[PDB]
Design a binder for these strands. Sequence first.
RNA 1: GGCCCGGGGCGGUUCGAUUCCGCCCUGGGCCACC
Length: 431
Amino acid sequence: VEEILEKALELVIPDEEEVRKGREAEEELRRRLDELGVEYVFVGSYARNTWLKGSLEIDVFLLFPEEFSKEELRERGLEIGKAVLDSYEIRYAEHPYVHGVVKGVEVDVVPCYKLKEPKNIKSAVDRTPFHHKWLEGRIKGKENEVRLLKGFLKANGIYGAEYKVRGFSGYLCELLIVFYGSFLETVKNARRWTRRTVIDVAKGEVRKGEEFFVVDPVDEKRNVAANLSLDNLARFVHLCREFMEAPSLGFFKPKIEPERLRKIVEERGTAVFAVKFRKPDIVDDNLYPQLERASRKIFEFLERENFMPLRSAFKASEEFCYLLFECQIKEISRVFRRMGPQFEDERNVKKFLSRNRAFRPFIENGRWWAFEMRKFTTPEEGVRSYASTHWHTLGKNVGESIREYFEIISGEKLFKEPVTAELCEMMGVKD
RNA sequence: GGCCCGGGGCGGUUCGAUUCCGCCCUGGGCCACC
Ligand SMILES: Nc1ccn([C@@H]2O[C@H](COP(=O)(O)OP(=O)(O)OP(=O)(O)O)[C@@H](O)[C@H]2O)c(=O)n1
Ligand SMILES: [Mg+2]
């Protein structure tokens, strides 16, 4: 360990050239903003020197009086953001902000209400400046520890808190370091975390609760780890146990033949198909929760129709989106048996038998049963039907897109699509 | 936009639904975009 972590610092700590570049960009931002005479404050990992090597992104916050309208914040904010960046892009889900570059560095110009007491927030990001003040004096000296933690989560796919990841936010990493004292202590204790572990940083306590909860020092009602999924919490805990057991530098390093994949699927004997549709032109933060719903809704449909679904997944390229499925049943019989009433109450038995049927119901164990016919005998046939009539329940945007067009890609043609990596992961193909 | 909790109308399926699949309207929270 001791040694491994030393080498690890070389992958997480920014070199003197990247730091300079960030400082050079910092000064430029101040000079441009001072010329406008705007009120701003630097926050985030850049401000606390906790940003991960190769992930430099400066956060500048524009402070506005709380009396201001949210519309005003949006208009003035974007006005200032655009006038201060070399080039910019504007694309958000709810809270507005401008993304750009200043002297080769990524920058986020974010508008927010300058308040006192983060109790009742007015804009989604009002806590941020307060997180900064709380951390400034506590994280000073332990920033390399935060970086190891970030580099660890990043190299293993659970670093972002955004929906595409559902992992650990940067701020959460910093609270953990403040709570445990170091990357190693965090990892040692995380091995004992549970799905009901509550970490109260301000109280310096860990208690049992109703769900994994990391209390914000700035607001006790805020769960800093709110969007961390159970499975990612589990992957982290399991990763911590492995790292302690066999301390490797590979834990900080970021981690196939389409013809091989065909052989594998052939050997598994499963039904592997995908629902393909055009990708809605919307933010990742809106797209993903929809693909998750769409993916889940179809998966549940496949389970109640007895196709015995194994797993589902999804891929979103720039063109299309794909919802992936694997089922144990490639084809089921046309008939099935519907349970009827007990022979005892004749009223319902009469109604049951009056039903026009093709085979005539029988008695088994004191109750009537009837052979009914399915409307589809293959997983693909059912999904084609489901997705055509229930598109409205597949997410607001993903559902409307599927309404205007979708297709079921199966067999040979499916391995030609940009989903091969996703399938391998989904099927547990190893090597 | 997604999730959670709660109201008020419906339709389909079923011998049988409040409870299965869905659809309108609506109240309150929460999360992602910093
Ligand atoms: N889900 C989020 C996202 C952001 N923030 C706040 O916004 C700040 C800036 O977050 P961001 O710029 O997204 O990342 P950093 O925290 O700066 O860390 P890094 O850029 O390395 O990801 C955080 O410090 C935190 O106070 C938060 O509380 N919760
Ligand atoms: Mg940043």
